[PDB]
Amino acid sequence: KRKVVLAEQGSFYIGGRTVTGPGKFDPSKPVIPYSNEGATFYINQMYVNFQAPVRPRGLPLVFWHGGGLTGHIWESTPDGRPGFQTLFVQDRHTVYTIDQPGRGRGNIPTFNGPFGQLEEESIVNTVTGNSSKEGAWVRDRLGPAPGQFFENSQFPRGYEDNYFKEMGFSPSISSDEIVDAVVKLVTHIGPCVLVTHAASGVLGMRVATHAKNVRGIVAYEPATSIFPKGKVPEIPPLADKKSQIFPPFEIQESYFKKLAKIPIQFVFGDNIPKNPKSAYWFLDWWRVTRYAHSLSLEAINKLGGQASLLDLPTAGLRGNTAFPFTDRNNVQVASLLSDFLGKHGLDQN
Amino acid sequence: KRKVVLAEQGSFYIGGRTVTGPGKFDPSKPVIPYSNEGATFYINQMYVNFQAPVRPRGLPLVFWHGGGLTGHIWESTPDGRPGFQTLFVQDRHTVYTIDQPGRGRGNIPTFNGPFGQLEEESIVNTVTGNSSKEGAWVRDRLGPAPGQFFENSQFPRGYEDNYFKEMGFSPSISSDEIVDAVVKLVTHIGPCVLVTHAASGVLGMRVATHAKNVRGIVAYEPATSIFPKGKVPEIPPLADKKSQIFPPFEIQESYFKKLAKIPIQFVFGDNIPKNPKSAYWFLDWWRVTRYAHSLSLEAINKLGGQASLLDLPTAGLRGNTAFPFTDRNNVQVASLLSDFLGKHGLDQN
Ligand SMILES: CCOC(=O)c1ccccc1S(=O)(=O)NC(=O)Nc1nc(Cl)cc(OC)n1
Ligand SMILES: CCOC(=O)c1ccccc1S(=O)(=O)NC(=O)Nc1nc(Cl)cc(OC)n1
């Protein structure tokens, strides 16, 4: 059912700073080609979209895309089925979707000169990085190798091109400045729930430690674990005995403790191996990363928290990729999110 | 005024091509840091958003942002009032809003290496260009100089930060590929009307010559004129006696003649001087640019066309900037668009 009734919708920019070129702006001189002379540039701002239902219930949801993605992934699946934006406006929540600084409609900080360079200052690096289709195929666990699907896959087959077209690079904006923009959004919104994904998992945890308005977190397949400073547990290398997962983020314990004050759920899909898998690097990477997250959640619970790990196969859902919210069974995944919101009173006024 | 009822909404990717790095992808080797080895990259694809009302009447509208912009400018004004997307869904049209290749949720083609470079191939230039706040202020005719406003201005004063935060750079993707993506969209949708702005003006004219499904064009402040090959009239240089306007685009007469088969309206706001203005480059640029457009429309009409120029002040609207659809009087600007659609039956089934 695709119908949606909105009390209001719109979008806006929030956060960011400015940087300035040298010299002066003279309106009598040719303005094009564009010049850094007398220039003021707005950089690192974030794009925010909102859709509000009639008679909302409970807290607004802020959907935060994963690495190299945009708010598109909450709008529609690659095969054109409704995304979580539609599903949760229908579930009577106001829904915010963002494009974080450096992605989509967020700002890409570049000027007149080599990419990212403002005269002699490097605002972001000129050299970029970006996953290939092949790297994303195995990262997202469509299958063990590019072009191959797990038998049980919930991926919308036949729409591979549509899916990979949604992905791209991120300039080297500091994570601090990305967190700063979302903290400012949370200040503007009021009490809310963060729904994060992959690379935004660790960022949403950080935002919660700076923003008491975050009243709950649901993180789909978070990519980087978080621990109190100096208390990172033993985490093994990968099966190739040379690689490691992402270095866990460490925060002051007084900030980490704020994570124990709200309900937190990490959600993982299927086909993460239980045993070392040296033939398939990213499958093994997910094995050890999920393990590190289990230890992170345990650390929160030992501070009095309520942090849980939901493996979708234990709930009866088999074959999900790293994007469970755009898989073929995304309505069932959404139902589990509604269950979490209902258990914790986040769907009541 | 804010309530919107959607039979369906969503977004999707369309257009683009693929490029590749050397070698083969091995899933047992570390996938991160990302590599060009064995890589397939999707590049130059376009993001498309659609909102459809219950029981649409007439043709879908395709809103195409100007230079360095995104579909945000059709969603909301800088001060948060409804944009043309909401207004025309309420006016019973299905509305498509795009982020063209190179902008917003469209693809920015870059890889592992210096910006835009895939091994030894330069997909897009590493050196970028980007307007300052000051350049944009005078380009968009907020006032003759940064910080100043024209009398009776319709700009949402006080929301300059929001406004300028929506602007950014565009990589050097060829115009051919941008036009290609929209031609593909037009085929997918079927008969439609293109509503363009500034830089997308000339591109929309080109799309229409390649796509019969374009049944009408409304262009807000187009930046580049279009003429038949070898038939560009004499265009005076600017008052500084050194600058000129954008070199007019020239196409084969066969293609140019297609523009005479559909209704076309160019819409201009206020404060474009009638006489030479050497002290204000962009004001003078706009004077001669509008003059060139008048001759372009004359050429279309001499081939049997239905082309017209609408100056908002003559319609009773004073103070508009180069973004009349986000100005304080944008509802009145929308009414004039509805009038054009009604005159040509483009609001009827
Ligand atoms: C599903 C969309 O993709 C992701 O978010 C994702 C998922 C798993 C692993 C890495 C990423 S990532 O590419 O975004 N990377 C990161 O999460 N951050 C990151 N951290 C480190 Cl230490 C290195 C690195 O290199 C690209 N990248
Ligand atoms: C409202 C956003 O601003 C515009 O769309 C706009 C308006 C007037 C002039 C130029 C642009 S532009 O910067 O987008 N540029 C172009 O339209 N194209 C363009 N053509 C040429 Cl031959 C040169 C050039 O240099 C920046 N740029």
What would the two tokens of residue B109 be? Answer: 């083609």
Quote the crossing angle between the two packed helices B175-189 and B200-210, to the nearest 10°: 60
Length of chain B: 349
Nearest CB among B5, B12, B29 relative to A5 is that of B5
- Taking the C-alpha atoms of residue A5 and residue A51, their distance in angstroms, rounded to an integer, is 9
Report the distance separating Cα B35 and Cα A135, nearest Å. Answer: 8
Residues 6+ apart with CB under 8 A from A342: none
**What residues are paired with A62 via a beta bridge?**
A96, A194
Query: Which among A6, A40, A278 has CB closest to B4?
Result: A6
Q: What are phi and psi of A290, to 5 degrees?
A: -60, -40
How far does the centroid of ligand 1 lie from the alpha carbon of residue A224, in Å? 8
Query: How far does Cα A23 stand from its chain's mean position?
Result: 39
Task: Specify whether the CB–CB gap between A73 and A333 falls below 8 A.
Answer: no
Give the alpha-carbon dihedral of A318, A324, A328, A331, to 10 degrees.
Answer: 100
Tokens 């309505």 — which residue?
A331
Gap from A258 CA to chain B (nearest CA, Å): 32
Helices A175-189, A200-210: inter-axial angle, 10-degree rounding: 60
**B 281-340 near A (Cβ less than 8 A):** 281-282, 285
Using CA atoms, how far apart are residues B224 and A124, in angstroms rounded to an integer?
32
* Whether the Cβ atoms of residue A138 and residue A127 lie closer than 8 Å to each other: no
Do you find a cis peptide bond into B33, omega within 30 degrees of 0?
Answer: yes
- Residues contacting B314, CB < 8 A, separation 6+: none
Sign of the torsion angle spanned by Cα atoms A305, A311, A316, A322:
positive
Residue-wise DSSP of A28-85: TS---S---TT-EEEES-EEEEEEEESS--S--EEE---TT--THHHHB-TTS-B-HH
Distance A341 CA to ligand 1 centre (A): 27
Q: Experimental method for this entry? A: X-ray
Q: What is the resolution of this structure in A?
A: 1.6
With tokens 């977004």, the residue in question is: B11
> What is the spatial distance between Cα B273 and Cα A316, in angstroms, rounded to a whole number?
69
**Ligand 2 centroid distance, CA of B200 (Å):** 9
DSSP B14: E
Q: B314-327 burial, b for 16+ CB within 10 Å, e for fewer?
A: eeebbbbbbbbbbb
Q: Which residue has the tokens 């191996």?
A: A273
Parse chain B into domains and list their residue ranges: 1-349
Tell me, what DSSP letter sits at residue A248? P
3 state DSSP class of B9: strand
Q: Which residue has the tokens 């009390």?
A: A7
Q: What is the 3-state secondary structure (H, E, C) of A193-204?
A: EEEEECCHHHHH
